[PDB]
Amino acid sequence: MFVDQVKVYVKGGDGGNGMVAFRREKYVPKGGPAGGDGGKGGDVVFEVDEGLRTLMDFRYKKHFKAIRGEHGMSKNQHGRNADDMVIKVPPGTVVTDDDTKQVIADLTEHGQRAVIARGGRGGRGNSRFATPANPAPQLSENGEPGKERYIVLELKVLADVGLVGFPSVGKSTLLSVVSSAKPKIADYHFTTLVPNLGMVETDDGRSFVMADLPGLIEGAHQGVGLGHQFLRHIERTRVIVHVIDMSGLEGRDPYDDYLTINQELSEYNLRLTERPQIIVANKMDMPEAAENLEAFKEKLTDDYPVFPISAVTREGLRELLFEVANQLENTPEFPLYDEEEL
Ligand SMILES: [Mg+2]
Ligand SMILES: [Mg+2]
């Protein structure tokens, strides 16, 4: 029900211009065409790479231009075909022309690639235009221009990390601070459920989709067959970032809230207790918060890494997102049933 969309400009290589030359040896004479042909320009090619999860790259650079083919040379030596510009895109990416509004490619398998903007053919040299009434032609072909087109990339968005914890703890303000961008809804204006999810971006290029688990879970409990959708979506979210409070404007006992939340999770019987977790001790800027984490760290018996941060900032969360990313690359999906049907 959520999809990311980005428009960019792609252009294939123009392709080398043919040459105009002649064999000029010290044979007391001169003549005979020798201009080599041009090489084809390169293609802008999209390739699927499961390692990717968001179209966040196409946001910092929306201009992809392939290299031009090689120009023809004398000695009838032709130019080689320029290498293509391969651009890695997430699985399930649909590419359409922002004009002919057509589907250029529907990339879905890893390694699956498609020609997005093809490069022009190389221009033929003079050696090609020689006829009996033109033994020494001065005609040459310039390279065929690489096609340029404005495209839009569409992607079906599915959460990767889930946010749990008491309300007002920060799950919302947090998911918002790191939320470099939010998806669009394609079922808009009815159930208006709209779980709270967003695409965050680390500082090393990596990126992923984060959401507030409760919202997803509550949608997986709707009737008239509307839960299945959210069930699948939950199998997708592989990491859990637990946010506890270390102060308590009206709350008390940190390790307590940790127990309360982790229990509910296991009660939904969805395997949310198997999913890796990353505790986030927030509100660390408070007095009591200093020693609370001291005790909390002790009582904690799990292997889950604790990331304490003060003032939810886009920078002070640098080391957090990083872990989320690393963990995310070492954790498998959580399907309810395996491939044991036979
Ligand atoms: Mg960065
Ligand atoms: Mg249902």
From Swiss-Prot:
One of its GO terms (molecular function) is GTPase activity. Residues 1-158 form the Obg domain. Disruption phenotype: Essential for growth, it cannot be disrupted. In depletion experiments cells become over 3-fold longer, are abnormally curved and nucleoids condense. Residues 117-143 are annotated as: Disordered. Induction: Part of an operon with spo0B. Changing residue 92 to D: Grows slowly, very reduced association with ribosomes, fewer 70S ribosomes in cells. No effect on sporulation or the general stress response. Replacing the last 22 amino acids has no effect on growth or ribosome association, but eliminates sporulation and reduces the GSR, showing for the first time that growth promotion and the GSR phenotypes are separable. Necessary for the transition from vegetative growth to stage 0 or stage II of sporulation, but sporulation subsequent to these stages is unaffected at 45 degrees Celsius. Required for expression of early sporulation genes, further suggesting a role in the induction of sporulation. Depletion effects on sporulation can be partially suppressed by missense mutations in spo0A. Strains depleted for obg stop growing after about 3 hours and do not induce the sigma-B factor following ethanol stress. An essential GTPase which binds GTP, GDP and possibly (p)ppGpp with moderate affinity, with high nucleotide exchange rates and a fairly low GTP hydrolysis rate. Plays a role in control of the cell cycle, stress response, ribosome biogenesis and in those bacteria that undergo differentiation, in morphogenesis control. Monomer. Interacts with TasA (AC P54507) in pull-down experiments. This is GTPase Obg. The lineage of its organism: Bacteria, Bacillati, Bacillota, Bacilli, Bacillales. The gene is obg. The chain holds residues 1 to 342 of 428 of the full protein.
